Design a protein around this ligand. Structure first.
Ligand code: FAD
Ligand SMILES: *[C@@H]1O[C@H](CO)[C@@H](O[C@@H]2O[C@H](CO)[C@@H](O[C@@H]3O[C@H](CO)[C@@H](O)[C@H](O)[C@@H]3O)[C@H](O)[C@H]2NC(C)=O)[C@H](O)[C@H]1NC(C)=O
Ligand code: DEH
Ligand code: NAG
Ligand code: MG
Length: 495
């Protein structure tokens, strides 16, 4: 019946569930699973997979699915930390957007239309190919899809200069629950606001984003330097880093990846300057001489090269490979946002815990700069002025380490508990692109829960969106009153 509808409407690229271990269905299913944690045979599988090739096919796909009794799941890059683009407790249809990966750059207006199956790397590659003086602000991981990423905000190495990816979206095409094809004018300002950070899988299916391309110099300066130190020095480095990072002028970003193993601590310093190396080094010589950076650490390169380099890719060309395996490990991650400086003992304790679990690592970013100049309600991401750091805790493992899964998860849980007193409180803040089901979830098939959905959902909702939660609920009711687009943490419509 679903197939007959799709055929009648000219949607041809689909595959039904097959039990065949290496069926084509299984190949398409796994192609974009980016967290192996959700790859095993015990996980829910789609009844069919549809690959629309145009906005019309996407529209008609949704229209057909509604005639039936299916849960819709949209997948762009498949990076959901909780696998929410390709799992469901109820029978579901997976709409995989990988064929919608066209990027159209308009050099006369310095904007681009980006189909939502496009990855960040594909976007960055397209931009660098078109111009040596344009770039875009989005995340660090190249295989992340624009569909989920921009829908949730999108923070990266240029966010201190230009804000989130979603802060630079000027139009969009949203396909709603009825298959309507809506641009910014059609969807209205509340819905256009909601889609720019309100979370993927909630408002409808984004077909394409229209973004403003942003100036970059023909040469930027970057460094990627790993310090191998002991805990005393690592603690003093991280404690000073937090001040340097938040306080740097907007033309600079200094971020950290860190981990340890008994007495050996490693800190990878990621630096970016919107300009030349003499200025870059003068700045860090003054503000952070403790890093011990030397001239040879500073590299001048194009913006495109810088984004490939900072992510550890071999070449700019690799940005354009959506199936390049960036990190093939099962993982779980949590995040904190901070409002007060972290005391030295917080870093010391975090490092002690990392030293006991070599499979764990942290990623540290400063806010400030343009992130403090954008109002908390400009887009749904509310963590602007007053927010000092974003701190990510990750534990990751390969298949040969699977028996330690429980131990790994316990470690992460204990790290998050340790950090509680030092980070944001009342509520403990989060980021919707860093979706965390530990906060809870709605079973939309449960009547008593659904009756109280707004209050229940406030637990994660206010963590992700603070005071923007209310407007999100109103936008949800306007664009998806029947809740066609739902998941355990989707914004509830009013009854
Ligand atoms: C795996 C991974 C994730 C990263 C990485 N680095 C990040 C960074 O530097 N900055 C960030 O801000 N975020 C980083 N993240 C997290 C990602 O930002 C999030 O995981 C994104 O949400 C992922 O988006 P995508 O890859 O498209 O993942 P999906 O699982 O397909 O979708 C997520 C979510 O959104 C819905 N959705 C997808 N596509 C659409 C469209 N077109 N319209 C509406 N909704 C859509 C899905 O159904 C799901 O709910 C680094 C790494 C390695
Ligand atoms: C539905 O969509 C999928 C995914 O795009 C289509 O599969 C893709 O088909 C193209 C050909 O049109 C493949 O391109 C070629 O692959 C071969 C190697 O296998 C190579 O010789 C060519 O140079 C080119 O790379 C592509 O590999 C393939 N992608 C995947 C993930 O399978 C499929 O054709 C569509 N199905 C229908 C019925 O339209
Ligand atoms: C499971 O695999 C991975 C998972 C993640 C990351 C890296 C991985 O390898 C990661 C690394 C980051 C490094 C730097 C950075 O800003 C400078 C980030 O925002 C990062 C975000 N993330 C998101 C989670
Ligand atoms: C609905 O949810 C409540 C609270 O989570 C749970 O206790 C109850 O068992 C559920 N009811 C049904 C009918 O599943
Ligand atoms: Mg077989």
């Amino acid at each position: 019946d679903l197939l007959s509808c799709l055929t009648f409407n000219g949607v041809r690229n689909h595959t039904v569930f097959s039990a065949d271990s290496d069926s084509d269905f299984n190949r398409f299913l796994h192609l974009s699973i980016q967290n192996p944690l959700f790859q095993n045979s015990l996980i829910s599988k789609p009844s069919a997979i549809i690959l629309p090739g145009s906005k019309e096919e996407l529209s008609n796909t949704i229209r057909c699915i509604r005639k039936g009794s299916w849960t819709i799941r949209l997948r762009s890059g498949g990076h959901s930390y909780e696998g929410l683009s390709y799992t469901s407790d109820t029978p579901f249809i997976l709409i995989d957007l990988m064929n919608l990966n066209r990027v159209s750059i308009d050099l006369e207006s310095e904007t681009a239309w980006v189909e939502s199956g496009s990855t960040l790397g594909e976007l960055y590659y397209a931009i660098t190919e078109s111009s040596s003086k344009l770039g875009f602000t989005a995340g660090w991981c190249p295989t992340v899809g624009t569909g989920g990423h921009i829908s949730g905000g999108g923070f990266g190495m240029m966010s201190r200069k230009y804000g989130l990816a979603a802060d630079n979206v000027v139009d969009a095409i949203l396909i709603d629950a009825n298959g309507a094809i809506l641009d910014r004018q059609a969807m209205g300002e509340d819905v256009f606001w909601a889609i720019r950070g309100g979370g993927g899988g909630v408002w409808g299916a984004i077909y394409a984003w229209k973004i403003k391309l942003l100036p970059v110099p023909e040469k930027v300066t970057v460094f990627r330097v790993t310090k191998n130190v002991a805990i005393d020095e690592a603690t003093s480095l991280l404690h000073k880093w937090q001040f340097v990072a938040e306080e740097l002028e907007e033309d600079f970003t200094l971020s950290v990846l860190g981990g340890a193993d008994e007495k050996q601590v490693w800190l990878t310093m990621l630096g970016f300057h919107f300009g030349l190396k003499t200025v870059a080094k003068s700045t860090f010589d003054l503000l952070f001489p403790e890093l011990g950076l030397v001239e040879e650490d500073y590299l001048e390169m194009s913006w495109g090269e810088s984004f490939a380099y900072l992510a550890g890719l071999e070449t700019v060309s690799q940005l354009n490979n959506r199936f390049l395996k960036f990190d093939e490990r099962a993982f779980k991650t949590k995040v904190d946002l901070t409002k007060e400086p972290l005391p030295s003992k917080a870093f010391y304790g975090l490092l002690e815990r990392l030293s006991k679990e070599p499979n764990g690592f942290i990623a540290l970013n400063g806010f400030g700069g343009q992130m403090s100049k954008i109002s908390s309600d400009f887009t749904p991401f509310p963590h602007r002025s007053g927010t000092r750091l974003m701190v990510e805790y990750i534990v990751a493992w390969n298949q040969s380490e699977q028996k330690k899964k429980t131990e790994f998860l316990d470690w992460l849980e204990k790290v998050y508990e340790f950090m509680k007193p030092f980070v944001s409180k009342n509520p403990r803040l989060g980021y919707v692109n860093h979706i965390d089901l530990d906060l809870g979830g709605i079973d939309w098939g449960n009547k008593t829960v659904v009756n109280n959905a707004i209050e229940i959902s406030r637990s994660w909702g206010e963590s992700y969106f603070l005071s923007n939660y209310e407007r999100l609920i109103r936008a949800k009711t306007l664009i998806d009153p029947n809740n066609v687009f739902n998941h355990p943490q989707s914004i509830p419509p009013m009854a």
